Amino acid sequence: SIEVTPLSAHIGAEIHGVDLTQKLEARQIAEIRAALLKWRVVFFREQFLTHEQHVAFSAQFGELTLGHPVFGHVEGHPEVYSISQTLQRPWTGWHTDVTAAVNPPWASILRGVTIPPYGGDTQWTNLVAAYQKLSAPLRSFVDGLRGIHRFTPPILVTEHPLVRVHPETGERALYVSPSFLKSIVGVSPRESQVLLELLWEHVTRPEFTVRFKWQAGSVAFWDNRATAHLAPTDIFDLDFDRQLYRTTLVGDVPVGPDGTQSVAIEGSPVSAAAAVALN
Amino acid sequence: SIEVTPLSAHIGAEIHGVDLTQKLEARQIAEIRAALLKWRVVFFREQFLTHEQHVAFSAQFGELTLGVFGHVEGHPEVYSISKYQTLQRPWTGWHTDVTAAVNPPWASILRGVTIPPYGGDTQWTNLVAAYQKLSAPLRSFVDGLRGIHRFTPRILVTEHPLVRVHPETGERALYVSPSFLKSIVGVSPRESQVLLELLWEHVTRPEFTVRFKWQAGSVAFWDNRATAHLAPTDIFDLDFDRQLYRTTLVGDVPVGPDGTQSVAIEGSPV
Numbered sequence A: 001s002i003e004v005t006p007l008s009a010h011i012g013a014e015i016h017g018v019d020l021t022q023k024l025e026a027r028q029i030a031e032i033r034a035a036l037l038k039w040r041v042v043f044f045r046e047q048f049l050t051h052e053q054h055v056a057f058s059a060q061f062g063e064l065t066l067g068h069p070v071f072g073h074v075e076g077h078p079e080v081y082s083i084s085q086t087l088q089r090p091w092t093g094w095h096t097d098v099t100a101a102v103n104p105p106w107a108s109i110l111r112g113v114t115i116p117p118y119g120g121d122t123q124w125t126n127l128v129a130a131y132q133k134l135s136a137p138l139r140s141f142v143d144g145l146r147g148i149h150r151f152t153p154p155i156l157v158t159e160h161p162l163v164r165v166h167p168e169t170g171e172r173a174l175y176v177s178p179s180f181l182k183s184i185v186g187v188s189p190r191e192s193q194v195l196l197e198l199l200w201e202h203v204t205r206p207e208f209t210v211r212f213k214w215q216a217g218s219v220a221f222w223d224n225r226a227t228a229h230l231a232p233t234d235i236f237d238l239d240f241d242r243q244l245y246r247t248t249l250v251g252d253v254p255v256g257p258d259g260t261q262s263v264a265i266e267g268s269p270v271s272a273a274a275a276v277a278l279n
Numbered sequence B: 001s002i003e004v005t006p007l008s009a010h011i012g013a014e015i016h017g018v019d020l021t022q023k024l025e026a027r028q029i030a031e032i033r034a035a036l037l038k039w040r041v042v043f044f045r046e047q048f049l050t051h052e053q054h055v056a057f058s059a060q061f062g063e064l065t066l067g068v069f070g071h072v073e074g075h076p077e078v079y080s081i082s083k084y085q086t087l088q089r090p091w092t093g094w095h096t097d098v099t100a101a102v103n104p105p106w107a108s109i110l111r112g113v114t115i116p117p118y119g120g121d122t123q124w125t126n127l128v129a130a131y132q133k134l135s136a137p138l139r140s141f142v143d144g145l146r147g148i149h150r151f152t153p154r155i156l157v158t159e160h161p162l163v164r165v166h167p168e169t170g171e172r173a174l175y176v177s178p179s180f181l182k183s184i185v186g187v188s189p190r191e192s193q194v195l196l197e198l199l200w201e202h203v204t205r206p207e208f209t210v211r212f213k214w215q216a217g218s219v220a221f222w223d224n225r226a227t228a229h230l231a232p233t234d235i236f237d238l239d240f241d242r243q244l245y246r247t248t249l250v251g252d253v254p255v256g257p258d259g260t261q262s263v264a265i266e267g268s269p270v
């Protein structure tokens, strides 16, 4: 029986009592999965893993994505991605991974190998809590809306529901991936702009968020169907080296409250892997 | 010699190696004060203090303010922070202590006594870093501006500089206390509104902030001349009691880059 230590009112929890270098029992896997669904992102400490152990841990929860030939490439490990002026608004940098694709990954597992003594914190926000905190007329309104997500690698275009029904819990997530969601289908450009800024300001309210200060050996495991996250920018500032590795798990096509699946509009398989590797 | 452990690139540090139940020696006091000036807010863990010890620790750094509100029996210097629809913007709730007064307290010391297992985190933002990250034309513009801060519970109105020159470090702070600053003097209402929302969005950017998860016996000590902070809103959201106690230290009248002191408009000083 794992130990689960929540970190805020509704998002984030530490898990202790699990040795991630070892294969886990079925009960441990189910307990971790339930904690992840409940707290949206779960964290481990003092887990010093090889690439093989990181992949082996990940495969207990789903199918691993297979990477990009250049971006984040780790030799011998296609499943492992290496992680080593803008117009500034409250939602700048906040995103859900690869939502420009028709089947975004449902989860990611990020481990810290070389971690600075300070700087480089990551944040997550709870898109289910955010949906629920919209007023009832706003919820009914966005239930029926669709959004275009775009990404251009250094071109993916997908139409997603603005409200994603979680396939394991049935909860509704405000699926507004701010870095990638560009427009709301069927409304005017100004209507779309105003509504997106309203929802993006909403989802970044502190009551929906948790902040994580990394240490060497830390692991973050988050549910992309219910979260967006924010990468640090204070690292490009300090002298410290920073090396993390990420795996991600293949997800299904999102569905909105009316049952309509997401629709691919444009995109190459190569462009999708670049988004997985870079987002 | 104290141990200082920074918590972000430019704001927040934990201090270890000090027993706050005892009178500190002058070297320890000086080291804590330097760490406070450098990191804007400093934190202590596992410091289980009486009200008397809280006051005594505070008095080593300045003069205690003497505040029915938050009343603590036998200790007029200690304020009780007890658990017992607004318009939501990024700056909602962010503030610098009592800037509606002509002499806001220069520091506050907040200690946690009854602390929820989760929920109730506090955040601070670095107003000096925020000033410095404005572009040069924006810095020069706000250097010359004044703002009206108001509080009505008696009624306090004060004109402060928008840029406060720190009396000990000489640094410039973007002194925009979002809960209390209401208007910019000498510009139109719409100009004031737009510029305040610009600066308030700016000062709440995550690169300027630090978040602190309380535990029982934790202490936060912050420099109000260089910070604003944000209280948690999840308190009634959860069925956990939450009890903290606060002391504050008497501050001086702020000064802007041109040397102009703040001006009391209505009300009495701290």
Ligand code: NA
Pocket: A095, A096, A097, A229, A279
């Ligand atoms: Na990402």
Ligand code: NA
Pocket: B095, B096, B097, B229
């Ligand atoms: Na306050």
